[PDB]
Amino acid sequence: PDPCSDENGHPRRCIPDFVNAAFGKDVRVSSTCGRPPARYCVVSERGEERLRSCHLCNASDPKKAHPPAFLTDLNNPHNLTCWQSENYLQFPHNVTLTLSLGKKFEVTYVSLQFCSPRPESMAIYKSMDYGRTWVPFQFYSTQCRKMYNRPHRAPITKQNEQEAVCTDSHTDMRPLSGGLIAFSTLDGRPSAHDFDNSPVLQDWVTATDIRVAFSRLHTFGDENEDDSELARDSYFYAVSDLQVGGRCKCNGHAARCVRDRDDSLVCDCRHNTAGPECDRCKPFHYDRPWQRATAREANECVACNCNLHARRCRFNMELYKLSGRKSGGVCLNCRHNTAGRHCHYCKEGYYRDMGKPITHRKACKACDCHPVGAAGKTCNQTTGQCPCKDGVTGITCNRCAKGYQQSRSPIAPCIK
Amino acid sequence: PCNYHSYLFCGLFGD
Amino acid sequence: TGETRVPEVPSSLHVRPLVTSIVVSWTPPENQNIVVRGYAIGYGIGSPHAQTIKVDYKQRYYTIENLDPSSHYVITLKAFNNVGEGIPLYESAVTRPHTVPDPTPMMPPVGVQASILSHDTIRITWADNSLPTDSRYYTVRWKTNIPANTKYKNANATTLSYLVTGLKPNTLYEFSVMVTKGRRSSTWSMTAHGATFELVPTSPPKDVTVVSKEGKPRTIIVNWQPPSEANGKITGYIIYYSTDVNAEIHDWVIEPVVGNRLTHQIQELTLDTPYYFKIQARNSKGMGPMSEAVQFRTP
Ligand SMILES: O=S(=O)(O)OC[C@H]1O[C@@](COS(=O)(=O)O)(O[C@H]2O[C@H](COS(=O)(=O)O)[C@@H](OS(=O)(=O)O)[C@H](OS(=O)(=O)O)[C@H]2OS(=O)(=O)O)[C@@H](OS(=O)(=O)O)[C@@H]1OS(=O)(=O)O
Ligand SMILES: O=S(=O)(O)OC[C@H]1O[C@@](COS(=O)(=O)O)(O[C@H]2O[C@H](COS(=O)(=O)O)[C@@H](OS(=O)(=O)O)[C@H](OS(=O)(=O)O)[C@H]2OS(=O)(=O)O)[C@@H](OS(=O)(=O)O)[C@@H]1OS(=O)(=O)O
Ligand SMILES: O=S(=O)(O)OC[C@H]1O[C@@](COS(=O)(=O)O)(O[C@H]2O[C@H](COS(=O)(=O)O)[C@@H](OS(=O)(=O)O)[C@H](OS(=O)(=O)O)[C@H]2OS(=O)(=O)O)[C@@H](OS(=O)(=O)O)[C@@H]1OS(=O)(=O)O
Ligand SMILES: O=S(=O)(O)OC[C@H]1O[C@@](COS(=O)(=O)O)(O[C@H]2O[C@H](COS(=O)(=O)O)[C@@H](OS(=O)(=O)O)[C@H](OS(=O)(=O)O)[C@H]2OS(=O)(=O)O)[C@@H](OS(=O)(=O)O)[C@@H]1OS(=O)(=O)O
Ligand SMILES: *[C@@H]1O[C@H](CO)[C@@H](O)[C@H](O)[C@H]1NC(C)=O
Ligand SMILES: *[C@@H]1O[C@H](CO)[C@@H](O)[C@H](O)[C@H]1NC(C)=O
Ligand SMILES: *[C@@H]1O[C@H](CO)[C@@H](O)[C@H](O)[C@H]1NC(C)=O
Ligand SMILES: *[C@@H]1O[C@H](CO)[C@@H](O)[C@H](O)[C@H]1NC(C)=O
Ligand SMILES: [Ca+2]
């Protein structure tokens, strides 16, 4: 049943399903009609003539209101529902929409379906932190230079793909209703084809919050005429559908994002990993340095082996380098009188008991080498023989050999 | 013909 | 049956990307109380908004045709009735690149022979059985194992022979040739090995280290390494040692050794005298150049 497990049961890359992260989520907007209730006018073009139909926006009445909840609700072509900004909030004044996902998402697109005509100037912003600092994502304007201080129709540079680009595309006043602006995060980016191996673009698609700012709106130039009321009431920002598409950032180690004990969206990490985005590795699995999963290689986090003598292991870069990029996990504070990186042998002054396996508690017996008999403390690990001096027959160098008598000298314990 | 007819180890690694 | 509400979100969605098409498969929603008239497939690069295909409720699978080769499409599935369109189900896929069928290769050149002329020049001669007009050109490649992880040097030739220049002396090289007519081209010919002629060394021995031996201070060991430009098989080494540097080679005592050994113990050395050292390499063609003297005093 598990997508992380293969047909035999081997590890494989895990990707969460493609979702519209915006759907059903609360969006904070700067303006909404109805408080106090004001009149708005819908403009419609047919042939060479323009027609205007004026309606009222009442926040209290459900059929007359246009709340920010109408951006994120289900989009129905038969019954469209759009949010509407306050009348005539033209440049310098702007209308912004902040969306908080509350987790790192690998954004593929950011789309907006408009009820009113598309803006003359719009910008998409993202947040790496959970709303502290903002970095631009994409700009849309007639004058990229004068409005957003970016080159107009700039081609995507290989040198900086992590930079927001400005275009005059999708800014046209026509269609006056139903206009769409869909931003493709990996569009035109030269190394987008090799995304799995490109961390530069992997960071570019990452966002925790999305902010869309409407800076300048399209106008006919009739607002400055004798009658300002009728004209200024027919210019506003209205959006029916806001879609932020993309998968949950889990670095290829999770198939789904689940809400935890503190009601926070987190990846359900696999391949022996842990973290909100599976960026780090589960304790006692530091045998290999952390690496993001690819299509060909699963890049699972390798478990430590201490032969059940140590509870904590640490990663050594030098040992990983000396192993030829194979393993670098060294066990910490080896118990039951054992030593070594993988805690596989008995420490100096101890020997292995052959009757019981290495995983057992009593795997290493004490090597009781005589202080005057034996030369050294460290003995034979497989047989349990102390390094005897003057050919001592003792197992722990305790008894003199045949014909040999015990001596007063500490250098020569037995004399023939 | 050209072949040999206990092995001792020697190691060297930097700090 | 039930048109009082908008259809429920579909249960499953599965894509299968091909070279120019995407096989889409789905399953209707779990709830049957709300009637469903059909399915709406929404595809496109980056966003699913590009194009929309509406199908009947009976349909369970659909292959999206006429697509770009290596593009990343986002497919969206909606369940629709008379009241409207339901909650969408999203999935993304990257189409497989357009594979071009490879041409049937040509016959490679035969009779490839390496003829060593000098220490830096080897001429390569090859034949062609295909030749009984054409604009076919031959390509030559060569590589030495030192330095490590180096690549083959390529050179184009229109005639049946090529003169290789800029080679190192006394070093084994591998040679092979290929024929290229156009989109059709033959693989590399049988590897022919050519070893360059030996030459007089052009570089002196590097890393000259002199140190006082612990035990018998009257004896001091000299350590040297072979030079980079050996230009052949080294047969011997000449060590020079004297108290004065300004004096010519004729004044300095000659101490030659064997080539297979890079160490030599010097016995009976004078006390409170500053010793200077110079080492040279021996070859079949000539002798290695002189090296810079090193300072070492005795107590
Ligand atoms: O000039 S009017 O007679 O249209 O005066 C405005 C009031 O008309 C409504 C009700 O329609 S009416 O009975 O024909 O007058 O208009 C609004 O609703 C209709 C649909 O009719 S229905 O009776 O509610 O079922 C919409 O028409 S249509 O788009 O379906 O063709 C109107 O849309 S529009 O003005 O043509 O763009 C719609 O008008 S509005 O967007 O609300 O302004 C009443 O509105 S209602 O309460 O929402 O139904 C108006 O009365 S009100 O007291 O000002 O609210
Ligand atoms: O018309 S505006 O008042 O909006 O100002 C025009 C400014 O655009 C430039 C370049 O802007 S910027 O590089 O982004 O700062 O026009 C010049 O560059 C663009 C882009 O270059 S390129 O050749 O396309 O790669 C050219 O546009 S385009 O042809 O590519 O579409 C301009 O050529 S053209 O007028 O469109 O035919 C090009 O103008 S020019 O041939 O260099 O004269 C700036 O011009 S520039 O400073 O002379 O390079 C203008 O900025 S300025 O401060 O008003 O000078
Ligand atoms: O040029 S090489 O093909 O030999 O590769 C060396 C480049 O690898 C980096 C980073 O690449 S990464 O590992 O993919 O993130 O350095 C690091 O990796 C190598 C492994 O190379 S190997 O051929 O597989 O063995 C380590 O070298 S080694 O100890 O295994 O010989 C590096 O160790 S060290 O810096 O030499 O001490 C290791 O560096 S580090 O632990 O990340 O610091 C690149 O180095 S980097 O730019 O400093 O990160 C190497 O690129 S380079 O252009 O050769 O400088
Ligand atoms: O339609 S067919 O009758 O021709 O059947 C083809 C089915 O085989 C797959 C899956 O094979 S499997 O995952 O090995 O079980 O084809 C793919 O086969 C391997 C994947 O191997 S791997 O071990 O999972 O890595 C890949 O080829 S290769 O690159 O290793 O040479 C291809 O997948 S991928 O491009 O890496 O994603 C793919 O081969 S295809 O190149 O010609 O065959 C299934 O294709 S798939 O849906 O695209 O993954 C086919 O399954 S199906 O049920 O018939 O649809
Ligand atoms: C419509 O607006 C008026 C403004 O005075 C308000 O009193 C009224 O309650 C609103 N309509 C509804 C149904 O709430
Ligand atoms: C239909 O559209 C109107 C627009 O004001 C909205 O009040 C209503 O809730 C919509 N109904 C559904 C089911 O979306
Ligand atoms: C929008 O207006 C606010 C002030 O209301 C300002 O801080 C911001 O810089 C303006 N521009 C954008 C693109 O948000
Ligand atoms: C050989 O000729 C081809 C075609 O002109 C060219 O692509 C290639 O680089 C040439 N190689 C050399 C070393 O001249
Ligand atoms: Ca809506």
Residue numbers in the entry:
A (entry chain A): 38 to 453
B (entry chain C): 138 to 142, 159 to 168
C (entry chain B): 764 to 895, 901 to 1067
List passages from the publication reporting this PDB structure.
To understand how NEO1, NET1, and RGMB assemble into a ternary complex, we determined the crystal structure of the minimal ternary NEO1-NET1-RGMB complex, composed of NEO1FN456, NET1ΔNTR and the RGMB NEO1-binding region (RGMBCORE) to 3.25 Å resolution. Strikingly, this ternary complex is assembled into a 3:3:3 stoichiometry, composed of three 1:1:1 “protomer” complexes arranged around a 3-fold symmetry axis. The backbone of the “trimer-of-trimers” super-complex is essentially formed by interactions between NEO1 and NET1. NET1 is an elongated and rigid molecule, making contacts with two neighboring NEO1 molecules in order to bridge individual NEO1-NET1-RGM protomers within the super-complex. The NET1 LN domain (NET1LN) forms the major interaction site with NEO1, binding to NEO1FN4 (“Interface-1, ” Figure 3A). The combined buried surface area between NET1LN and NEO1FN4 is 686 Å2 and involves predominantly hydrophobic interactions, with NET1 residue F55 in the center. The second interface is formed by the NET1LE3 of the same NET1 molecule and a neighboring NEO1FN5 domain. In contrast to “Interface-1,” this interaction is of a predominantly hydrophilic nature with a buried surface area of 572 Å2 (“Interface-2, ” Figure 3A). The NEO1 FN5 and FN6 domains interact with RGMB, as observed in our previous structural analysis of binary NEO1-RGM complexes, via the high-affinity “site 1” interface (Bell et al., 2013). A total of 4 N-linked sugars and 4 non-covalently linked sucrose-octasulfate (SOS) molecules are bound at the complex surface.
